[PDB]
A paper describes a structure:
Cell surface glycoproteins in the [name] Als family (Als1–Als7 and Als9) are most commonly associated with adhesion of the fungus to host cells, as well as more complex interactions such as invasion and biofilm formation, for which adhesion is a prerequisite (7–9). Als proteins are one of the most widely studied [name] virulence attributes; deletion of [name] produces the greatest reduction in adhesive function. The N-terminal domain of Als proteins (NT-Als)4 was implicated in adhesive function, prompting work to solve its structure.
Removal of the C-terminal AFR to form sNT-[name] (amino acids 1–302) resulted in a folded protein that was monomeric in solution, with excellent dispersion of amide resonances. sNT-Als3shorter version of NT-[name] that excludes the C-terminal AFR. The crystal structure of sNT-[name] (amino acids 1–302) in complex with the model peptide hepta-Thr showed that removal of the C-terminal AFR did not affect the formation of a fully functional PBC. The observation that sNT-[name] bound hepta-Thr was confirmed in solution by ITC.
Numbering used by the authors:
A (entry chain A): 0 to 298
B (entry chain B): 1 to 7
Write the structure that this text describes.
Amino acid sequence: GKTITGVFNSFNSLTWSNAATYNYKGPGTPTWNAVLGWSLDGTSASPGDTFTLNMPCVFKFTTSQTSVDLTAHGVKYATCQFQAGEEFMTFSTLTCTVSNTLTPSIKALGTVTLPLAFNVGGTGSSVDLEDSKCFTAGTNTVTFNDGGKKISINVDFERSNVDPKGYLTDSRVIPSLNKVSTLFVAPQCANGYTSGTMGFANTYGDVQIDCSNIHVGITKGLNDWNYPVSSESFSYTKTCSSNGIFITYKNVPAGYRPFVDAYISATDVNSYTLSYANEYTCAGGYWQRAPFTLRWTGY
Amino acid sequence: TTTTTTT
C-alpha cells in the first residue's frame, strides 16, 4: 500500500534489565526494554501498508529474534522487522507491515517492547564518534520517531564505574558480522605524552585481528563511558597482522589520549583472551611499562 | 576467575 506515519505515538517506559552482572546501568550495557504505545485504525490503514520507526543512538537489538509483532487484545495487527544500526549507521530502525487482520472496522491500541543496547561510542569510527555525544551520566531524554511525531522519555543512565585515568578497554559484539570491536585507550598523561607503545594481540591462536577495520587516533578526552569523542591524526607508526595491532607514538599534546581499536574474530566470541602492550612516558618524565592480559566473556 | 564481560 502506502507509507503511513504517526503509528507509534508514545514512549511509555524505558527500563534496564541487567543482561549479565554489569556494575553500572549504562546505555550500552544490555538490556534496555523500550515500551512504546502504538495505534492502528482500519479506516486509515490497510493490510500491506508500511511504516518505519527511527531510533537514534540505538546500536542493536539484544535478541536473536529478527522481527516483533504489534499485537493488541490478543490479535496481531502488524509485523515489524528489526534493523540494527551497528557500525553502519548511528540509528536503528523498525520496518513494519500492516497485517490482514486490520480489517476496516478494527481500531487497535497497543504497546510493544523492544530489547535495546544504545550506542554511546566504542571505536574511532564516524558512527561511534557521532553517537559518543548522544548521552551523559544522569537524566537524559531519549527520542524516537515514526516520521513526524517525535516520542520521548526521560531516563537515568549511570556512568561507567571504571576510573578514567587508567588504561581503558571495550569489547562490543557486532551481531551481523560475528565480529567484536575491541578498544584500548592508554593511561592518562594529563600534560601530554613524550612517547609510548600500545596495542593488543591474539594470545592462544583463537583470535584474529581484522586489519581492514581498525582505527588509530588521539581523542580530546572521553565521555561518561570512557569512549573516544574525537579522533585526530598524530605522530605514530603501526604494525598490523591477524595476530595483533601495535603502535608506537610520540608527542601527544596535553588533553589528548591515544587509542587503538580493531574488529576481531574469535573461535568463540563469548570466551577469548587478549594480550596488551602498555608502555608510556608522560611529558615531564613519568614512565610505566605494564603489559597485561584480559579474559573476555559473553556468558 | 577475573573476566570482563563484553557488550
